[PDB]
Write an enzyme that holds these catalytic residues in place. Structure first.
Site: not given
Ligand SMILES: *[B]([O])([O])[C]([C]N1[C]=C(C([O])=O)N=N1)[N]C(=O)[C]C1=[C][C]=[C]S1
Length: 265
Positions: A212, A45, A80, A210, A143, A48, A107, A105
């Site tokens: 994740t 993420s 998310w 961040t 994805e 972003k 989506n 974050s």
């Molecule tokens: B991003 O990292 O592309 C997105 C949104 N997200 C999740 C987090 C977190 O878990 O702290 N921060 N931002 N990531 C996803 O949608 C995939 C996933 C990560 C955890 C569960 S689904």
């Protein structure tokens, strides 16, 4: 001193059960700390932040962009998306979508903004425009989070992230008002308190984004840090690990940031 962090990073990697990527730059010196700073890591993420910067860059040529209302439907929602969910009944402006993407974050908000910007290739082109030759975004939420080992899709290097972050937050890539807006969004991030922010003395101003991925122990943070009365420091910490179920660690990102800062003494 900048070359005495390798063994401490190696130990941290070994404890973590994966790979850590760090690049930290003191804008006073020009001095840097690297460790796998040239290797690709998935953005997750963290793309972003750069997305919002791209929106701001468009807004310099297009008055009224940020206040444009986007009345999305429930179909725009994906997991998310806490803010997009909450505001489903009202819609959100481009600026509100940008702040949600950076600060929560979100989506759905990020994908809506990607669509405005010409998709993953459009964001990639914007990063090329500021001299980042490493960044690539290839896919959309969710994805882009696949984080398959060896796969270069939706990755950059810690070095390129930091260099691009510096240009956008401190350099000349954005107009004054836009630049300040970018810094402000990063400063009000809510998702990063256990990452680079945890490594920094409480008195220092911090802005961060961040990422994740949720698989392959893949997570990250990048930040601008303002040490009281001194030049800013810009840095990026990225992680990945060999097995799909390996758990990411926020503690490892913070410990990596503390080492990089120590290395800049
Ligand atoms: B991003 O990292 O592309 C997105 C949104 N997200 C999740 C987090 C977190 O878990 O702290 N921060 N931002 N990531 C996803 O949608 C995939 C996933 C990560 C955890 C569960 S689904």
């Amino acid at each position: 001193l900048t070359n005495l962090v390798a063994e401490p990073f190696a130990k941290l990697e070994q404890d973590f059960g994966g790979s850590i990527g760090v690049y930290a730059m003191d804008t006073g010196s020009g001095a840097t700390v690297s460790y796998r700073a040239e290797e690709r890591f998935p953005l997750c993420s963290s793309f972003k932040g750069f997305l919002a910067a791209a929106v701001l860059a468009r807004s310099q040529q297009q008055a009224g962009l940020l206040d444009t209302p986007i009345r999305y439907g429930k179909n725009a929602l994906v997991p998310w998306s806490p803010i997009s969910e909450k505001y489903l009944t009202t819609g959100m402006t481009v600026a509100e979508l940008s702040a949600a993407a950076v600060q929560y974050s979100d989506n759905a908000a990020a994908n809506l903004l990607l669509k405005e910007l010409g998709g993953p290739a459009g964001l990639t082109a914007f990063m090329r425009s500021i001299g980042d030759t490493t960044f690539r975004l290839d896919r959309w939420e969710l994805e882009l989070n696949s984080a398959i080992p060896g796969d270069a899709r939706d990755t950059s290097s810690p070095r390129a992230v930091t260099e691009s972050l510096q240009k956008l937050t401190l350099g000349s890539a954005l107009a004054a008002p836009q630049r300040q807006q970018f810094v402000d969004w990063l400063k009000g991030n809510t998702t990063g308190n256990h990452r680079i922010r945890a490594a920094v003395p409480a008195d220092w101003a911090v802005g961060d984004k961040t990422g994740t991925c949720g698989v392959y122990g893949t997570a990250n943070d990048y930040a601008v840090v303002w040490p009281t009365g001194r030049a800013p420091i810009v840095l990026a910490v990225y992680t990945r690990a060999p097995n799909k179920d390996d758990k990411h660690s926020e503690a490892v990102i913070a410990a990596a940031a503390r080492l990089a800062l120590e290395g800049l003494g």
